[PDB]
Amino acid sequence: VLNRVYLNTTLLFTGYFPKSGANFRDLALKGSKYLSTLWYKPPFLSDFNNGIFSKVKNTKLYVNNTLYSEFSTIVIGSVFVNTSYTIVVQPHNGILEITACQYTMCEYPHTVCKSKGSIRNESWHIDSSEPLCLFKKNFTYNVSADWLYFHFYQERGVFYAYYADVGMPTTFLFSLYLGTILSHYYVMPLTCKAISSNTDNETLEYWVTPLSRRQYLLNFDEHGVITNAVDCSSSFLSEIQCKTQSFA
Amino acid sequence: LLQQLFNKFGAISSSLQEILSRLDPPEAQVQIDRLINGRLTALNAYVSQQLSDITLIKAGASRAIEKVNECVKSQSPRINFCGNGNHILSLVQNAPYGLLFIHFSYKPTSFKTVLVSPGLCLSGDRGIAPKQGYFIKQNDSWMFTGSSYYYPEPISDKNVVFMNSCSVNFTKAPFIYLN
Amino acid sequence: TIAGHEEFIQTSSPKVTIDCSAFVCSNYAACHDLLSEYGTFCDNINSILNEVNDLLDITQLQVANALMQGVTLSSNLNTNLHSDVDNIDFKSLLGCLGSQCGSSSRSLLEDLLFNKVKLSDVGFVEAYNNCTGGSEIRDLLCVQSFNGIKVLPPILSETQISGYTTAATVAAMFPPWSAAAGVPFSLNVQYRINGLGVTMDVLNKNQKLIANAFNKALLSIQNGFTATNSALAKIQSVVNANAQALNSLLQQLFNKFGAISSSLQEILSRLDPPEAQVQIDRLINGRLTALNAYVSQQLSDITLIKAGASRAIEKVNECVKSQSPRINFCGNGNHILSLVQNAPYGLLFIHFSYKPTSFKTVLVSPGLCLSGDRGIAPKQGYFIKQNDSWMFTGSSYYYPEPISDKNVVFMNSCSVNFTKAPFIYLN
Amino acid sequence: NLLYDSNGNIIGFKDFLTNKTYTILPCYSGRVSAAFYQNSSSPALLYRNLKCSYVLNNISFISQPFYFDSYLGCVLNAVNLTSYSVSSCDLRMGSGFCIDYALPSSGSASRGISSPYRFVTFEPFNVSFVNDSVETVGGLFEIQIPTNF
Amino acid sequence: PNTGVYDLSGFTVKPVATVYRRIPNLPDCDIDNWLNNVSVPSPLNWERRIFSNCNFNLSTLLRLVHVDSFSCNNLDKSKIFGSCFNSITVDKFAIPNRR
Ligand SMILES: *[C@@H]1O[C@H](CO)[C@@H](O[C@@H]2O[C@H](CO)[C@@H](O[C@H]3O[C@H](CO[C@H]4O[C@H](CO)[C@@H](O)[C@H](O[C@H]5O[C@H](CO)[C@@H](O)[C@H](O)[C@@H]5O)[C@@H]4O)[C@@H](O)[C@H](O[C@H]4O[C@H](CO)[C@@H](O)[C@H](O)[C@@H]4O)[C@@H]3O)[C@H](O)[C@H]2NC(C)=O)[C@H](O)[C@H]1NC(C)=O
Ligand SMILES: *[C@@H]1O[C@H](CO)[C@@H](O[C@@H]2O[C@H](CO)[C@@H](O)[C@H](O)[C@H]2NC(C)=O)[C@H](O)[C@H]1NC(C)=O
Ligand SMILES: *[C@@H]1O[C@H](CO)[C@@H](O[C@@H]2O[C@H](CO)[C@@H](O)[C@H](O)[C@H]2NC(C)=O)[C@H](O)[C@H]1NC(C)=O
Ligand SMILES: *[C@@H]1O[C@H](CO)[C@@H](O[C@@H]2O[C@H](CO)[C@@H](O)[C@H](O)[C@H]2NC(C)=O)[C@H](O)[C@H]1NC(C)=O
Ligand SMILES: *[C@@H]1O[C@H](CO)[C@@H](O)[C@H](O)[C@H]1NC(C)=O
Ligand SMILES: *[C@@H]1O[C@H](CO)[C@@H](O)[C@H](O)[C@H]1NC(C)=O
Ligand SMILES: *[C@@H]1O[C@H](CO)[C@@H](O)[C@H](O)[C@H]1NC(C)=O
Ligand SMILES: *[C@@H]1O[C@H](CO)[C@@H](O)[C@H](O)[C@H]1NC(C)=O
Ligand SMILES: *[C@@H]1O[C@H](CO)[C@@H](O)[C@H](O)[C@H]1NC(C)=O
Ligand SMILES: *[C@@H]1O[C@H](CO)[C@@H](O)[C@H](O)[C@H]1NC(C)=O
Ligand SMILES: *[C@@H]1O[C@H](CO)[C@@H](O)[C@H](O)[C@H]1NC(C)=O
Ligand SMILES: *[C@@H]1O[C@H](CO)[C@@H](O)[C@H](O)[C@H]1NC(C)=O
Ligand SMILES: *[C@@H]1O[C@H](CO)[C@@H](O)[C@H](O)[C@H]1NC(C)=O
Ligand SMILES: *[C@@H]1O[C@H](CO)[C@@H](O)[C@H](O)[C@H]1NC(C)=O
Ligand SMILES: *[C@@H]1O[C@H](CO)[C@@H](O)[C@H](O)[C@H]1NC(C)=O
Ligand SMILES: *[C@@H]1O[C@H](CO)[C@@H](O)[C@H](O)[C@H]1NC(C)=O
């Protein structure tokens, strides 16, 4: 919660949460030379209704015993043409670059690993005229983290983003007024020379589940850290736990 | 309960006469609804209090019926039920919203300090215990007295209960073969 | 042998008082001006709670009158010297009585009971004494008392009730014998066991075993208040029910009842006195409804408490102070006597009973037909055949003894299924 | 920067300017119990579970010449007389204490001023006492038996 | 009145002092500069500005713009004068005459 601390207690709280018992979908795509057009189809092009929760694997590469962080970039928009705004979240090896601009998006966008670059060039937009932007900001993350977590949602024309790189519960990253409704998101395929099984056996992973407004019971420990949660409408035991406000 | 008719309950007045002589039927109903809700709440509270008081009244009535059956109509062998101990009998009279019981009891007025024994061991290792009384020594002879009035009288079979053995702290008395 | 078991009876409850305008409006001047226009609403709540607490005081005086009615003691009695009669130790039941004691103590059984219940009458006082400071940082009782909800002490302290139960216990041990029917304690035990159908020869031979069984039963009661005792759970249920009711009443101050907020501070810092009164009126109506519901529930619980107190007074009069000829009233049958101890919000009764341990299969007759067509029936026993001779035995202990006039009831005729016995002209 | 409980109240904060941390407690609130006897000019007062130093420093600053601390709290306008005992009382304060009223008569005209209220011990029941022995006098017991009724 | 024990009305300990904390040296919000801007949008493309971490007051604002009317809803004008907020959002557009 916003600027509050809760200490050694349970709390009943309604927020933009995932549904317990639903499914994640691993929408990450790795390529080497060819790009399939079926990758850019409404199996993978999905609906942004209220928002998404994502669990992202931080893939670590080593060149001359030096660490490189890599994961997929995500785009959120409506029609992906230069008469609308798209939000792009892209990593740059410890720097998370977040932009919201009127990009001229390509038909088949992809990104390229920078540590050991691939055959293709990075091409997700072509804009030789510096388009209009509402938001342009760089943040930092832990390069030695195993997982990253993101909340993205919208309400009354405002976009909200939360993230975490140490531990599971996320903290507020930014908000941005748009005045319009976002409708689609897409996880962009990453083209790399060496990630597969004949190489060092690394994988890309980007798990996405939808968000909705619902009530949870949260447990805060002595230091104020969220340690346990229960979705109140997921099972019978969860209904008992939320009517007693107790985890046992 | 009658004082509740002068509360306003958030309305402009507690009087329906003053409301209905100032306002229109659209505007008067908003004021009358508050008085209606307040007075219905007061009646509900009174009704709940009466329903709670009737249970105490029924418990008292069952106790009075028990005292009529077992202290006035007969005399039970229960001690300390009617009166206080040393209770003799009771009479009953009608009273406003109930009954008036008159209890009569035995009351001692003067006393005497006596040395008593709770039982005697007779020859043949037999024992006698006194029945609602004590064994006393008068002129170095064992006699009986009742426990509520001092009156020495001879030990007989109507005063004692016989035992084929005797207790370990009964007083020895081998001279007794009395009436 | 002799078995003992304890039983708790509730006679009182915590006396809750409520400041109605402090619960509804707290501090705020604006809320108080509004509350007045509701007139006589808080006065009825205060009146009903005062009537409930007066009923509690009346029942406590009735219990204390039943404990002390008609007991005469010796002025030379001193519990430091006089705590044992007929090889039975009463030390764990007696408080401190005499002319050199100073009556501010309990017995050690009452000390064992009162140390496992934190919120007794003295626990509430020492908890409210710490509200200026908090004594950790905070407590639920101080938050309740700052919103006008407080538990008051009873009119009699618990050491006074312990002195009353000590007087009632010592009235059965010592040569007035006001509580033991004018006879010594061991003789009274012997006559009560004989009334069940046990001959007096066995009771005269086994007095020391009876005293040892009494000591063992008292020691077994003393080491039994450990986490599964029914009386301890029944005592703790009273405190837990009171704490739950007060916490649920305190939780009503965070309901919105249809208003924009449950806080008067947030309403009065945002709105004007025309617009604020519409919001404050909803909170006032919701909180008055909650207080009415609590007051109705308390008025219903006091009737159950009074019924339990009248039952405890009946057991004090007819099981401890005397022994009634009623069967199955105290205890379970084969009941001998009862003792009483003070308990948090009530009384603890200790019942002693006769318990058979081994048995024997006997062939019995319920009556004999003697010559001249006369009949005899046994008095609380049976007729048995030993060496082809008719003898008597008591119904609760096997001990054959000769048939005499003290064992039988004579009838001028005899029943149709009585056993024929023409050889009997015995003692 | 703000510490909350589960009901939504702020119970602590961190200061922006000094980086110091504090907890917040509510101020004291309570009521007074007035024991009043009819036709008297003022009642006796009881502040329950409060020391008299707190009452004189933090609550009331009017002149109160008579005060003492008792087991129930701070008592104003009464005399401490708990060694005295009474068997009936109409001003019962709890835990075996009572407030008695005794005006100074014409014969007992008190020149030194004091209060007509007295804080005493309430004891409604007693046992009867006899002057007999508790043990055997030569194997016999000593008892009192009535001779008239 | 009769002889009895009476529980009187509840008191509260009166506060001795006042603790007052504010952040110093914050810039001005300058809401009048945005309201008096030359470019005025239509209701079809109405504009929004968010103001936070700044100081404002209503007196200079209501005297520096030419006020025709100023009303408030779920709030009161006199309660704004010493208060702090998380943010203030200001939307503006020009009015067509018949609407
Ligand atoms: C915001 O986004 C929009 C996209 O929605 C951007 O608009 C796009 O701008 C592109 C320019 O960079 C433009 O690409 C092509 O446009 C040129 C004009 O084509 C017309 O004129 C031709 C005259 O020679 C004509 O041949 C052509 O007809 C072809 O296409 C139609 C289908 O459209 C077929 O039916 C015909 O049979 C024929 O094949 C059009 O009528 C075009 O000439 C360019 O192609 C040449 O150049 C290429 C690179 O040099 C080369 O590879 C190619 O072979 C040709 O030689 C050019 O590729 C998009 O058409 C246009 N899209 C829309 C929807 O308007 C907009 O620029 C952007 N804004 C900003 C500020 O970035
Ligand atoms: C966010 O970080 C990225 C990467 O560190 C910055 O992109 C670099 O910008 C400089 C200056 O324009 C270029 O010389 C580099 O070639 C860019 N690197 C890459 C990988 O694109 C970006 O400018 C930063 N954004 C902000 C707002 O500071
Ligand atoms: C209170 O703590 C904050 C840290 O949160 C201090 O702010 C830092 O101040 C130094 C020098 O003024 C800067 O170099 C840091 O970048 C600041 N940190 C942040 C997170 O802004 C602040 O100075 C402290 N105040 C006092 C009085 O000690
Ligand atoms: C009124 O608003 C306009 C925006 O519509 C302001 O114009 C901006 O001015 C700055 C510097 O003069 C430029 O960098 C921006 O590009 C301008 N905005 C646009 C959309 O062109 C203008 O400054 C405002 N007026 C005042 C007095 O502040
Ligand atoms: C944990 O929470 C409980 C409340 O249930 C509290 O009593 C306890 O003090 C807390 N623990 C610590 C270490 O503060
Ligand atoms: C790794 O080391 C080799 C030789 O030491 C060098 O040619 C190469 O450029 C290094 N890699 C990077 C990413 O600098
Ligand atoms: C990538 O870009 C470079 C520089 O423009 C170019 O030389 C190279 O051919 C490009 N790669 C491909 C696969 O077109
Ligand atoms: C986060 O970074 C710190 C140092 O920057 C490091 O000590 C820590 O291990 C990192 N977290 C994880 C999960 O590796
Ligand atoms: C990667 O996996 C293959 C499995 O065929 C294995 O042979 C190889 O040793 C693995 N390499 C590493 C670096 O784990
Ligand atoms: C019998 O009397 C003696 C002395 O009076 C006493 O020590 C003993 O305990 C008594 N025994 C019983 C069973 O009363
Ligand atoms: C009251 O406070 C004292 C000292 O602060 C402490 O020893 C005692 O246990 C407290 N009592 C209660 C009931 O909290
Ligand atoms: C004292 O009180 C009684 C109330 O019964 C009243 O009748 C009497 O007048 C009072 N005395 C004086 C002097 O007012
Ligand atoms: C009140 O008097 C009693 C003796 O009657 C004494 O023990 C007690 O300490 C006194 N209290 C105060 C506060 O002086
Ligand atoms: C015992 O209480 C009665 C109550 O009327 C009283 O008369 C008597 O003086 C008291 N006796 C002692 C010794 O306190
Ligand atoms: C009565 O008790 C007193 C104790 O003060 C004693 O001195 C006196 O001898 C006793 N009298 C009798 C007859 O026992
Ligand atoms: C009993 O008392 C009455 C009146 O007090 C008296 O007339 C009578 O003689 C007394 N009887 C005896 C036996 O003392």
Residue numbers in the entry:
A (entry chain B): 51 to 298
B (entry chain A): 1043 to 1221
C (entry chain B): 795 to 1221
D (entry chain A): 646 to 794
E (entry chain A): 299 to 397
Sentences from the paper on this structure:
To unravel the mechanism underlying the interaction between the S protein of HKU1-B and the host cell receptor TMPRSS2, we elucidated the cryo-EM structures of the HKU1-B S protein incubated with TMPRSS2 in various conformations, including a closed conformation, two 1up conformations (designated as 1up-1 and 1up-2), two 2up conformations (with or without TMPRSS2 bound, referred to as 2up-TMR and 2up-1), and a 3up conformation with TMPRSS2 bound (referred to as 3up-TMR). The sequence identity between the RBDs of HKU1-A and HKU1-B is 74%, while that between HKU1-B and HKU1-C reaches 98%, with only sporadic mutations observed at the RL3 site. In the closed conformation of the S protein, these loops engage in interactions with adjacent RBDs and NTDs, stabilizing the structure of the S protein.
